[PDB]
């Protein structure tokens, strides 16, 4: 993918044009590279969303609402 993109960039230096097959190969390689670096951020909750009584917020977990941030032990924001 890197080689094909670099060739596409430097083709104009020597006054050439890219044939459609080269473009298709470069597109396929770029798609293959972009596949390997997906993110999918997977959005979190709101922050004031209630936590139901089914989670036993009285004894199991002290908080009764969704945090909205990473809990820690000593950094404590």
């Amino acid at each position: 993918a890197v080689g094909y993109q670099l060739l596409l960039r430097m083709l104009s230096d020597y006054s050439l044009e890219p044939t459609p097959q080269v473009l298709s190969n470069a597109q396929r390689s770029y798609d293959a590279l972009m596949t390997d670096t997906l993110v999918v951020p997977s959005m979190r909750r709101r922050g004031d969303f209630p936590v139901g009584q089914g989670n036993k917020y009285d004894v199991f977990t002290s908080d009764r609402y969704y945090p909205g941030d990473l809990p820690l032990i000593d950094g404590d924001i």
Partner: protein
């Protein structure tokens, strides 16, 4: 689930709707309580014994 390297839990809301009839039955009993009663027989002194 992990949910981007955490352990956020599913919301679990509870709306109790099955205790209404149970409370109604309990109130029905507590409004009219029952106990043990002794009935007399066909003798000369069964009434005093039952009392």
């Amino acid at each position: 689930t992990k949910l981007d390297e955490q352990f956020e839990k599913y919301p679990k809301f509870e709306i109790n709707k099955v205790a209404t009839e149970l409370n109604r039955i309990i109130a029905e009993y507590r409004n009219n309580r029952i106990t043990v009663k002794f009935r007399p027989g066909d003798r000369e002194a069964s009434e005093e014994l039952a009392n």
